[PDB]
């Protein structure tokens, strides 16, 4: 019974606000007395290609910022720019602020997204940071500033602030210090992501999950070293497997009785021969956004 | 970017409590001054096969119910049984109760699930009521009493309270009046649902979703009648299509400009010739847990 599940979103929902500059508007994140939002909000339509953010910013007063939390207008007391984020100081502390921290997630790791429009939460889903530092999100116009997060105990680890859609339909954004994931810049120019690779640790977890679910037609009796598997994997644009990843897969290996390198030998034959029309957990494509942690939990 | 998306769960998270009788514990739903929970909580481990709930309930008083809303304890002031649910009147009106309704959902309709573990939310995901009145959910031990719901403009429509997992790994529960979906009874005995069917109206809406998102390869120049299509549907364990179904699909037909019976002809070809190892909206099976409403909203 494996499926993508999001963390409950309530702790983030009480932090979503709307931020408007003139006629340009997007989502912002209200923690304590600070509102975080993409600095792109200070662009007019003409500014959106080739903006000079330091010029646009110095030309702004606090009153230019219209910050709305539901029915309530909050007043910007002060404002500073931090990389590609604005930090708006505001006259009131959010009573709903959860315990939180700002983290920089790593490729292969998952998080929940609260997709938001004009400061209003719309939906929640899980997705993963890709090796090429984009995310395959589900985002419409007005979603700029929507936030990605994980929850451990009662602490929300914010890790993603949505900025833009790339021409291929994938998405780019920043951490909550405003540093972009990947080689992107916040301008309305056509930017291409590098070629993507498959998250091997997660494909391996998925194969383990399929074995736990009773499907083992892809297992074989070949052996491989880590080095020889990594050489094959890179020829098929799969990420090489580190020994840390082998350690991460330890619990699934012990539960199923299939040594990590033996599952790699299964994967190797799948990569070289394909699936001869067979399916795994019902699909002909190897899923790579289900983490070992997700498998173990479900 | 088209994926299953759950409603933001904040309004439901504020209603989740833990209910314990002796050592038996599960989740309850706290609305105004009432906690709703499965009556199975009044079972000792020895009672859980073939219990007599009328017998067990008369032997308890308000004191025997321990209700915890996080750190706070709520005092039970009264109690009664309604079908397979207990209604516990409490001390305190939940200050966080949203605008809400209780609805009974029909087969093929979708809802979000807030999976909970002994009173604490842990995950959220979208699923559907199967034609055979079970749910293909993701529920672990301790999830009894978790709730399913939809949201329409600040009003939460509760439609499902989780009770149990069947031998096949699917799930069974009640509406918020305590009446089970399907042929099931709340006791720890092996029970089976009827044979399931694929939700034709949902597959068709998902094919429209694909057309809108650019996936056009499965279309053909052909067309079919309702009666001939249903001859194919029965042979492949799909639900028969009705004119109401066709009427429901009108807006999706208009937006894409593909007549409904034209999409049925494409579906008939997909069922008969299988897919070519190609994908529709990223998946390699015909998805049937998106309603026409879901496709529009996304
Ligand atoms: C299809 N899609 C998927 N994700 C996105 C996110 N996204 C967005 O929501 N808005 C953007 N531009 C704006 C236009 C506005 C018009 N008004 C009146 N107000 C607006 C505010 C914004 Cl932010 N963009 C484009 C974009 C946003 C950036 F932050 C950036 F650095 C470069 C960009 F090209 C956008 O991608 N849309
Ligand atoms: C793996 N899984 C998938 N869904 C479920 C839901 N589920 C559940 O969470 N609990 C159940 N039995 C209990 C045992 C308890 C032990 N303690 C200390 N407290 C307990 C409370 C419960 Cl409810 N069940 C079984 C079950 C629950 C019912 F409500 C019912 F009518 C029949 C049943 F067989 C269960 O399925 N677990």
Asked whether the beta carbons of residue B10 and residue A6 sit closer than 8 angstroms, the reply is: no
Active site annotation includes B144: yes
d(CA B53, CA B44): 11
Structure solved via: X-ray
Ligand 2-lining residues (CB < 6 angstroms):
B 23-26, 38, 40, 139-144, 163-165, 186-188
Give me the sign of the Cα torsion angle A142, B279, B135, B253.
positive
Rounded to 5 degrees, what are φ and ψ at B153?
A: 50, 70
Task: Give the angle subtended at the CA of A229 by the CAs of A223 and A232, to the nearest 5°.
Answer: 125
Which resolution in angstroms does this entry have? 2.0
Alpha helices in chain A (DSSP H): 10-13, 53-58, 200-212, 226-235, 243-248, 250-256, 260-273, 292-297
Relative to the alpha carbon of B39, which ligand is closest? 2
- Choice among A15, A21, A37, A40 that is catalytic: A40
Joined together, the tokens standing for residue A1 give 């019974």
Quote the CA–CA distance of B24 and B4 in Å, as a whole number: 34
Residue in B195, B220, B194 with CA at minimum distance from that of residue B207:
B220
| B15 vs B114: CA distance, rounded Å | 11
Question: How, if at all, do strands B155-165 and B99-102 pair?
Answer: parallel
Q: Do the Cβ atoms of A166 and A134 come closer than 8 Å?
A: yes
DSSP-derived 3-state class of residue A290: coil
> What stretches of A23-97 adopt beta strand conformation (E)?
24-31, 34-38, 65-69, 72-74, 76-82, 85-90
Which distant-in-sequence residues (6+ apart) come within 8 Å of A297 by Cβ?
Answer: none
> Which residue among A21, A127, A144, A159 is the active-site one?
A144
- B52 Cβ contact partners less than 8 Å away, ≥ 6 residues apart: none
* CA B161 – CA B28 distance, rounded (Å): 9
Tell me whether residue A116 is one of the annotated catalytic residues: no
- Return d(Cα B85, Cα B180) in angstroms, integer: 10
Token pair in block for residue A293:
């942690």
- d(CA B245, CA B242) in angstroms, rounded, equals 5
Instruction: Report the distance separating Cα B102 and Cα B176, nearest Å.
Output: 6
Residues with Cβ within 8 Å of residue A6, at least 6 apart in sequence: A112, A113, A124, A125, A126, B6, B123, B124, B125
Contact between A282 and B277 using a beta-carbon 8 Å cutoff: no
**DSSP characters over B58-70:** HT--GGG-EEEET
* CA B38/CA A163 separation, integer angstroms: 44
Distance of CA A59 to the CA centre of its chain: 33
CATH of the domain at B70: 2.40.10.10
- Index of the ligand 2 atom closest to the CA of residue B144: 9
Q: Which pairing describes strands B85-90 and B99-102: parallel, antiparallel, or unpaired?
A: unpaired
Residues in Cβ contact with A272 at an 8 Å cutoff, skipping those fewer than 6 apart: A232
DSSP percent split of chain B into helix, strand, coil, nearest 5: 25, 30, 45
State the Cα–Cα distance between residues B124 and B139, nearest whole angstrom: 11
Length of chain A equals: 298
The angle, 0 to 180 degrees and rounded to 10, between the axes of the packed helices B260-273 and B226-235 is 30
CA distances from A163 to A45, A49, A106, A166, A202 (A): 16, 14, 18, 10, 26
In 3D, which of A28, A3, A292, A2 has the Cα closest to residue A158? Answer: A28
CATH of residue A283's domain is 1.10.1840.10
Closest CA to B290 of B247, B249, B236: B249
CA A163: distance to chain centroid?
Answer: 12
B199 and B108 Cβ atoms separated by less than 8 Å: yes
| Contact by Cβ (8 Å): A30, A10 | no
Among A40, A45, A123, A174, name the best residue to mutate to test ligand 1's pocket (greatest count of ligand atoms within 8 A of Cβ): A40
Ligand 1 atom closest to the Cα of residue A189 is 34
As given in the structure block, the two tokens for residue B73 are 């304890």
Pairwise CA distance, residues B120 & A271, whole Å: 42
Alpha-carbon dihedral B281, B286, B287, B293, rounded to 10 degrees: 80
Mutate which of A164, A167, A188, A189 to test ligand 1's pocket (most atoms within 8 Å of Cβ)? Answer: A164
Domain enclosing residue B57, as ranges: 11-90
Tokens 């979603």 belong to which residue? A143
Calpha distance A192→A215 (Å, rounded): 38
Three-state DSSP class for A76?
A: strand
Say what angle helices B200-212 and B260-273 make with each other, to 10 degrees: 100
Q: Evaluate the CA torsion angle A69, A75, A78, A83 in order and state its sign.
A: positive
Of all residues in chain B, the one with the smallest CA distance to A123 is B7
Q: How far apart are CA A142 and CA A40, in angstroms?
A: 12
Q: How far is the CA of A144 from the centre of ligand 1 (A)?
A: 6
- What's the CA gap between B140 and B163, in Å, rounded? 11
Cα–Cα dist B114/B121, whole Å = 7
């Amino acid at each position: 019974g494996f499926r993508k599940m999001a963390f409950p979103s309530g702790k983030v929902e009480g932090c979503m606000v709307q931020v408007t500059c003139g006629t340009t508007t997007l989502n912002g994140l209200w923690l304590d007395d600070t509102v975080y939002c993409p600095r792109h909000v200070i662009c007019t339509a003409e500014d959106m290609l080739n903006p000079n953010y330091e010029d646009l910013l110095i030309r702004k007063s606090n009153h230019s910022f219209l910050v709305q939390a539901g029915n309530v207008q909050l007043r910007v007391i002060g404002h500073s720019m931090q990389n590609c984020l604005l930090r708006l100081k505001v006259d009131t502390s959010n009573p709903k602020t959860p315990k939180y921290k700002f983290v920089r997630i790593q490729p292969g790791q998952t998080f929940s997204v609260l997709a938001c429009y004009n400061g209003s939460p719309s939906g929640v889903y899980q997705c993963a940071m890709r090796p090429n530092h984009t995310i395959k999100g589900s985002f419409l116009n007005g979603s700029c500033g929507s936030v990605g997060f994980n929850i451990d105990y009662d602490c929300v680890s914010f890790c993603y602030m949505h900025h833009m859609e790339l021409p291929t339909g994938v998405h780019a954004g920043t951490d909550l210090e405003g540093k972009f994931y990947g080689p992107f810049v916040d301008r309305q120019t056509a930017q291409a992501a590098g070629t993507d690779t498959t998250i091997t640790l997660n494909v391996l977890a998925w194969l383990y999950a399929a074995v736990i679910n009773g499907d083992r037609w892809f297992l074989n009796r070949f052996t491989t070293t880590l080095n020889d598997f990594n050489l094959v994997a890179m020829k098929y644009n799969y990420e090489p497997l580190t020994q840390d990843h082998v350690d991460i897969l330890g619990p699934l290996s012990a539960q199923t009785g299939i040594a990590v390198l033996d599952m790699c030998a299964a994967l190797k034959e799948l990569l070289q021969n394909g699936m001869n029309g067979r399916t795994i957990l019902g699909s002909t494509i190897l899923e790579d956004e289900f983490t070992p942690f997700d498998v173990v939990r479900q």
